[PDB]
Design an enzyme around this catalytic site. Structure first.
Site, PDB file in Angstrom:
ATOM      1  N   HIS A  74      -5.805   9.072  -1.279  1.00 48.75           N
ATOM      2  CA  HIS A  74      -6.079   7.667  -1.561  1.00 48.75           C
ATOM      3  C   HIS A  74      -4.818   6.863  -1.829  1.00 48.75           C
ATOM      4  CE1 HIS A  74      -5.396   8.106  -5.916  1.00 48.75           C
ATOM      5  NE2 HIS A  74      -6.003   9.273  -5.790  1.00 48.75           N
ATOM      6  N   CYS A  75      -4.956   5.552  -1.644  1.00 50.35           N
ATOM      7  CA  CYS A  75      -3.905   4.611  -1.997  1.00 50.35           C
ATOM      8  C   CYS A  75      -3.852   4.509  -3.517  1.00 50.35           C
ATOM      9  CB  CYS A  75      -4.201   3.250  -1.372  1.00 50.35           C
ATOM     10  SG  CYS A  75      -3.037   1.949  -1.808  1.00 50.35           S
TER      11      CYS A  75
ATOM     12  N   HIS B  70      -4.061  14.470  -2.651  1.00 48.46           N
ATOM     13  CA  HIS B  70      -4.320  15.512  -3.642  1.00 48.46           C
ATOM     14  C   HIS B  70      -3.956  16.903  -3.117  1.00 48.46           C
ATOM     15  CE1 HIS B  70      -7.496  13.087  -6.179  1.00 48.46           C
ATOM     16  NE2 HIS B  70      -6.332  12.472  -6.083  1.00 48.46           N
TER      17      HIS B  70
ATOM     18  N   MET C  24     -10.096   2.392  -0.001  1.00 47.38           N
ATOM     19  CA  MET C  24      -8.867   2.965   0.543  1.00 47.38           C
ATOM     20  C   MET C  24      -8.714   4.423   0.110  1.00 47.38           C
ATOM     21  SD  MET C  24      -5.383   0.770   1.062  1.00 47.38           S
ATOM     22  CE  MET C  24      -4.227   1.397   2.271  1.00 47.38           C
TER      23      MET C  24
ATOM     24  N   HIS D  63       0.836  -1.192   0.000  1.00 51.67           N
ATOM     25  CA  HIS D  63       0.000   0.000   0.000  1.00 51.67           C
ATOM     26  C   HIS D  63       0.875   1.247   0.000  1.00 51.67           C
ATOM     27  CE1 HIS D  63      -3.594  -2.437   0.786  1.00 51.67           C
ATOM     28  NE2 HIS D  63      -2.885  -3.057   1.712  1.00 51.67           N
TER      29      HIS D  63
ATOM     30  N   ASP E 281      -1.631   8.696  -1.542  1.00 49.48           N
ATOM     31  CA  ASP E 281      -1.561   9.843  -2.440  1.00 49.48           C
ATOM     32  C   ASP E 281      -2.476  10.934  -1.893  1.00 49.48           C
ATOM     33  OD1 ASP E 281      -1.971  11.733  -4.438  1.00 49.48           O
ATOM     34  OD2 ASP E 281      -2.557  10.284  -5.974  1.00 49.48           O
TER      35      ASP E 281
ATOM     36  N   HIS F 236     -28.283  12.385  -5.916  1.00 46.51           N
ATOM     37  CA  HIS F 236     -29.554  12.599  -6.581  1.00 46.51           C
ATOM     38  C   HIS F 236     -29.595  11.972  -7.970  1.00 46.51           C
ATOM     39  CE1 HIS F 236     -33.446  14.293  -7.391  1.00 46.51           C
ATOM     40  NE2 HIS F 236     -33.446  14.887  -6.211  1.00 46.51           N
TER      41      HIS F 236
ATOM     42  N   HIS G 254      -7.494  -0.805  -5.227  1.00 47.70           N
ATOM     43  CA  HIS G 254      -7.366  -0.318  -3.857  1.00 47.70           C
ATOM     44  C   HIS G 254      -8.407   0.761  -3.572  1.00 47.70           C
ATOM     45  CE1 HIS G 254      -3.402  -2.149  -2.468  1.00 47.70           C
ATOM     46  NE2 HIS G 254      -3.716  -2.755  -3.598  1.00 47.70           N
TER      47      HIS G 254
ATOM     48  N   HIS H  16     -27.581  15.980  -2.510  1.00 42.71           N
ATOM     49  CA  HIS H  16     -28.818  16.725  -2.284  1.00 42.71           C
ATOM     50  C   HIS H  16     -29.330  16.465  -0.876  1.00 42.71           C
ATOM     51  CE1 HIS H  16     -32.794  18.530  -3.300  1.00 42.71           C
ATOM     52  NE2 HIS H  16     -33.280  17.534  -2.582  1.00 42.71           N
TER      53      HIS H  16
ATOM     54  N   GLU I 126     -29.565  23.525  -4.982  1.00 43.13           N
ATOM     55  CA  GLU I 126     -30.402  22.371  -4.666  1.00 43.13           C
ATOM     56  C   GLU I 126     -29.551  21.105  -4.705  1.00 43.13           C
ATOM     57  OE1 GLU I 126     -33.531  21.450  -7.662  1.00 43.13           O
ATOM     58  OE2 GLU I 126     -32.459  22.835  -8.983  1.00 43.13           O
ATOM     59  N   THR I 127     -28.738  20.972  -5.750  1.00 41.06           N
ATOM     60  CA  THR I 127     -27.931  19.792  -6.008  1.00 41.06           C
ATOM     61  C   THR I 127     -26.644  20.300  -6.639  1.00 41.06           C
ATOM     62  OG1 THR I 127     -29.919  18.458  -6.380  1.00 41.06           O
ATOM     63  CG2 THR I 127     -27.834  17.573  -7.181  1.00 41.06           C
TER      64      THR I 127
HETATM   65 CU   LIG Z   1      -3.702   0.099  -0.854  1.00 39.37          CU
HETATM   66 CU   LIG Z   2     -35.290  15.458  -5.124  1.00 41.87          CU
HETATM   67 CU   LIG Z   3      -5.886  10.779  -7.076  1.00 41.99          CU
END
Ligand SMILES: [Cu+2]
Ligand SMILES: [Cu+2]
Ligand SMILES: [Cu+2]
Ligand SMILES: [Cu+2]
Ligand SMILES: [Cu+2]
Ligand SMILES: [Cu+2]
Lengths: 333, 333, 333
Positions: B128-129, B93, B143, B88, B91, B299, B138, B248, B272-273
């Site tokens: 994330h891995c 961001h 993960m 493993h 990462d 949604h 993964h 939503h 709303e969304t």
């Molecule tokens: Cu992993």
């Molecule tokens: Cu709705």
């Molecule tokens: Cu990434």
């Protein structure tokens, strides 16, 4: 004290048309009264004759567009005639509380209810049926629409200057999941309840069989094309209650776009294509500059031209060679 | 000279809860120390008892939410106990260089490593891995997580005025691709390595079998519902490391939304969304105005109510009839 | 009077490279002349040798990037040599009228045409072939590209200050729908027309078999990696003519992002991942701060690492331990 507010009853019109309204509010806050009748009915959605049991507000897919101003009260009489078979309700994304009214509006066939809510946020909003345990079935059977809550002083561009539209259309885009036999032919069912278990399995694939504007393939084409004139300012409201869409005007632009449909935000300018997330309504403003036929599409072009998410505009007026011209027409070399 | 900076060790809490922090920074820049232990474990993700071999940071799906301020240093001790079977890494961001730390943090079972990076950009970010050749396996085995890098002066609305939240929750949304037999029953495997080849084929369909909040269908429902009070200001951080989502709040709004999660940008108002693209974290701020049960959903309502991407809020306080009322309760006509 | 405007003929370059241009316009408005030759050809898109009949502008997938300034005129000579078999045309999302030029540019094999349009809106825009009745087949066979319409005073950040790039690359992302036999092996066809009916059925599944950058799996890797230096300012233009994408620079950010590609709008800052809707071009500006290998991906990581939507940058210069360092390298506990 809402009892002392003026009341105005409004009669809705079928999409893609929109009931009469004022952009800039000429009155104080009002109680705006709407009635909608739920209709379960058979619908032919394509040229091959595929039939679904649609679940509609007021007999149309999508449900009609409602228009009010910020801080109006919306009062909806919702009727479920006894010719229907299912429990229905209504969820307004515009409203605050009780699952958008869903928890307060559960009506069996033979029942009615009256809901009131205050339209506190300006924007275009989805509304849809959402009965506990059966939400996606109703929505993807066509039971959704939109409400536009205009600012009291109307729409504004990114600089805070007025935008006035000459015409408004409502395009409701619907994903359908029609069950198939082994070979890929669509099934028919005598009653909605018959279709239920196959519908659930069809939905789980996450792959629509049809994506249509205004309830059927080709619904907005030919004699049912949207119309405008060069120099006319058109607002196109577009909703998708369940699935993402990416509208595009072939030959045009979104001069001013609220992709997620909320007017306190500045619009995006000069858009070629914009993403309306599933469960959202958006609005696009365009001034037509050239005549002729335009296609309005979901720019997943498979969804548009194979699955049905394409309409036409027919625009009248003079051709402008400064913007575009054929210098050498197609000819053998 | 980082050696002369204060150090603070932080103990993480399970989602949907978030470790204690200050919104507005009360100290200068710090080195903030975190430890995470990788755990491969069996997880029951649905009411039918479907079991997957999940790959977790600190025993949870999602991994815990980390909170620091801009220009802090993040120091992560990453431990891979010898009870695990796979290589493993991690990462971020949020970080700059070496594949977000992935190239520096490859730990076989029985190994540990300590990474440091400077949190130069304010926002919520996915981590994330991402092991070479096996990244999506993964990630879609659970993960992944998020880190929030607050501005030193906290959050601001579109006008540059302070926004203070009363409560914060972390919703991690996970798409799973559980292999199926011919008939559509889920398979079981004794070891992750056993599942590999079937997992790859399942992923390639691009169709999740489950989409869940906090690691299981119904994980955020009933007694595990999120709680708030009318008048409370709630920040909901939402991440999706692999697939687009459209959150939503049924009955509510996003008053202020950073859909793509980066705080130097003004928020979107009155949503709303909103669309959180796969591989992004977003944040939504809402002040509750009405009590009762709210559903927090993706949604795409099929994904929410059929595949699992739905949770509940339980909100206490007084009902406000000005915002919403039943004028005529459901009754026979 | 366009006859009295200066004319400049431009020779296009293969992606990911971009023909020479000025960021800030050093002349008045011009007529900028381009020639493109349509080529139907066999393309190997993956390491297994899968072959498709690609439909190209100028022999590449994507078609080359065109660069002009706002209120220039674009004059395109489009040639369809008689070695081709199909009718083709070109639709510019940058242009106004006649289906983006599509209605004016229908050329059978052995025909040519010259179109002119005024580039009235600044931005990056998709262009693509769109023959009536066969639009998605051509587009998803690789017949699409982009045009960049720069503001006459170049790009600006959110505060209206100049942004100058040192390097520009064009990444065109293509979804392919290669038909499969029962077992899942790809089919071969002697002529495009042979493939038509299977292509339509393959497209309708809405599930790409391949998603690639610059026309093939691994096209932008190894010796074909994109290059930059620490401290260099790079603009990455990214288009997707049919399907949504969510680009991510593993190890980096989008410092300034126009996700939907339209420069009159302020950029989004500090993006980890952004959504480019199908049928849109976007642009991202990054200043490299760390050397080494970066992966540029669609952050649906299945689409990137299983289906092909991943490329590499190779960046030279000095490592900066302030931003990131290994405090304790991976070791047994
Ligand atoms: Cu992993
Ligand atoms: Cu709705
Ligand atoms: Cu990434
Ligand atoms: Cu219903
Ligand atoms: Cu073509
Ligand atoms: Cu197009």
């Amino acid at each position: 004290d809402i009892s002392t507010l003026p009341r105005v009853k409004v009669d809705l019109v079928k999409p893609p048309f929109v009931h009469a309204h004022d952009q800039v509010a000429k009155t104080g806050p009002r109680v705006v009264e709407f009635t909608m009748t739920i209709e379960e009915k058979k619908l032919v959605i394509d040229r091959e004759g595929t039939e679904i049991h649609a679940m509609t507000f007021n007999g149309s897919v999508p449900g009609p567009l409602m228009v009010v101003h910020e801080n109006d009260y919306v009062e909806l009489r919702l009727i479920n005639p006894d010719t229907n078979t299912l429990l229905h309700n209504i969820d307004f994304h515009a409203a605050t509380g009780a699952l958008g009214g869903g928890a307060l509006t559960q009506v069996n066939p033979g029942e009615e209810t009256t809901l009131r809510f205050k339209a506190t946020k300006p924007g275009v909003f989805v509304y849809h049926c959402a009965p506990e345990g059966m939400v996606p079935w109703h929505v993807t059977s066509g039971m959704n629409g939109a409400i536009m809550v205009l600012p009291r002083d109307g729409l504004k561009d990114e600089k805070g200057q007025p935008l006035t539209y000459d015409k408004i259309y409502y395009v409701g885009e619907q994903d359908f999941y029609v069950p198939k036999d082994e070979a890929g032919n669509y099934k028919k069912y005598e009653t909605p309840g018959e279709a239920y278990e196959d519908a659930v399995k069809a939905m789980r694939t996450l792959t629509p069989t049809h994506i249509v504007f205004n309830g059927a393939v080709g619904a907005l084409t030919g004699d049912h094309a949207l119309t405008a004139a060069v120099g006319e300012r058109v607002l196109v409201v577009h909703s998708q209650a369940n699935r993402d869409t990416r509208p595009h005007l072939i030959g045009g632009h979104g001069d001013y776009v609220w992709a997620t449909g909320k007017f306190r935000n500045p619009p995006d300018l000069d858009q070629e294509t914009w993403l309306i997330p599933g469960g959202t309504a958006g609005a696009a403003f365009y001034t037509f500059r050239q005549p002729g036929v335009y296609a309005y599409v979901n720019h997943n072009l498979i969804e548009a031209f194979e699955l049905g998410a394409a309409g036409h505009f027919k625009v009248t007026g003079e051709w402008n060679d400064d913007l575009m011209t054929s210098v050498v027409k197609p000819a053998s070399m």
